[PDB]
Design a protein around this ligand. Structure first.
Ligand SMILES: Nc1ncnc2c1ncn2[C@@H]1O[C@H](COP(=O)(O)CP(=O)(O)OC[C@H]2O[C@H](O)[C@H](O)[C@@H]2O)[C@@H](O)[C@H]1O
Ligand SMILES: Nc1ncnc2c1ncn2[C@@H]1O[C@H](COP(=O)(O)CP(=O)(O)OC[C@H]2O[C@H](O)[C@H](O)[C@@H]2O)[C@@H](O)[C@H]1O
Ligand SMILES: [Mg+2]
Ligand SMILES: [Mg+2]
Ligand SMILES: [Mg+2]
Ligand SMILES: [Mg+2]
Ligand SMILES: [Mg+2]
Ligand SMILES: [Mg+2]
Lengths: 197, 197
């Protein structure tokens, strides 16, 4: 028997996040519940945000993956992640990705590809994002002196690491600093390693 | 200046998840708030769970990545993910990995590598997992006819896709029906294609 949602009761709602009690039908026709999380900023027929995989390309160097370091309140510490942001109203995933990349890193990129909506943590929330691959011409005079343009309550640090040695460099950051690496960044790094050998 | 947590005020706590209002100090010395989510099952000094990257190997065959498909209440639909589960009390990440892999797919594997705790969705929750790379000897009799041993309220479908064509195969599954691929699975698949550049 196929499963389906029966009802979604609001438990508590903040200005950005809300908790819900989800009642659904299981394969055996039995009613069960689940505690779900959702963002209050999600628009209809639109993913919550985007994560950007910024590939910095330079003539004299191997490719680099541009990451950002930010203090994350929910984590109680600093985290290393792909640049990311919530999609603004009417804005396409691609546009959101280029804007957030420039805002958080100062780099002006070009779209390479865009994934369909993927889930962030399906066992807990309904949060989804588009993973957008963007290339950056690191030799262009325009990208010589990049500087972020963060908002009021935002201070991002840019950290670019070699694509051919990503996993190792991420491990070093974890060991030497008070940092947590994002699961998507690490999954990306593991496959780069697994593909290689 | 270094940012840090000033206080955490409980907003709503459930059986599995809770919502809190976090107050922290920004780089300038000003206090700001943030809405954060946490799992109530989280034990101090340990990550919430593990995600397993199972590589099914067989002589003279392409390698396959074992994934699971399950109905996810928060998403209101089915999702394709790496087998994963919460870490049991006192259980090590590696043991959780092999245990969850067997319960969800029936396969018995060997640990290849284990990542440090990485965050699932930092801008929203404090959820963390260890991504454990595991290899499955597809030529061993015990792995010939593996059968999932799920819980009372767990219903999983095993889907193994070729590692050599992972991203394309994921797209083909999504073209067939309403399905959402996990962001970590997609990040992994993307890097397999982006590697060697
Ligand atoms: N939970 C919150 N509590 C208080 N204020 C909030 C919260 N979420 C967002 N905001 C406000 O909206 C802004 C969105 O920042 P983005 O930069 O536009 C989005 P970013 O934070 O970068 O996240 C991008 C993706 O990764 C995150 O972990 C989520 O998965 C998200 O989908 C935050 O910087 C803050 O000003
Ligand atoms: N939110 C919830 N509401 C109601 N009951 C719950 C909830 N979370 C866990 N449970 C209970 O604990 C079990 C944990 O299953 P795992 O299988 O042990 C953990 P799994 O679901 O697989 O997730 C593992 C990792 O990937 C998922 O996205 C999770 O968010 C986590 O990051 C659930 O099957 C259910 O019995
Ligand atoms: Mg951001
Ligand atoms: Mg933004
Ligand atoms: Mg932003
Ligand atoms: Mg599970
Ligand atoms: Mg379990
Ligand atoms: Mg399980």
């Amino acid at each position: 028997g196929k499963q389906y949602i029966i009802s979604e009761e609001l438990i508590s709602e903040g200005k950005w996040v809300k908790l819900e009690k989800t009642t659904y039908m299981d394969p055996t026709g039995k009613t069960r519940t689940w505690e779900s999380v959702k963002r209050t900023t999600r628009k209809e027929q639109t993913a919550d945000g985007v994560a950007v995989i910024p590939v910095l390309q330079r003539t004299l160097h191997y490719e680099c993956i541009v990451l950002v370091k930010q203090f994350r309140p929910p984590m109680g510490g600093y985290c290393i992640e792909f640049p990311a942001g919530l999609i603004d109203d009417g804005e396409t995933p691609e546009a959101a990705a280029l804007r957030e990349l420039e805002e958080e890193t100062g780099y002006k990129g070009d779209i390479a590809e865009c994934s369909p909506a993927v889930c962030m943590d399906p066992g807990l929330s309904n949060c989804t994002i588009h993973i957008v691959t963007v290339t950056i011409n690191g030799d262009d005079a325009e990208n010589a002196r990049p500087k972020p343009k963060p908002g009021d309550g935002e201070f991002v640090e840019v950290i670019s690491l070699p694509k051919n040695d990503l996993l190792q460099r991420l491990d070093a950051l974890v060991a030497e600093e008070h940092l947590t690496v994002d699961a998507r960044v690490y999954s990306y790094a593991l496959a780069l390693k697994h593909a290689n050998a």
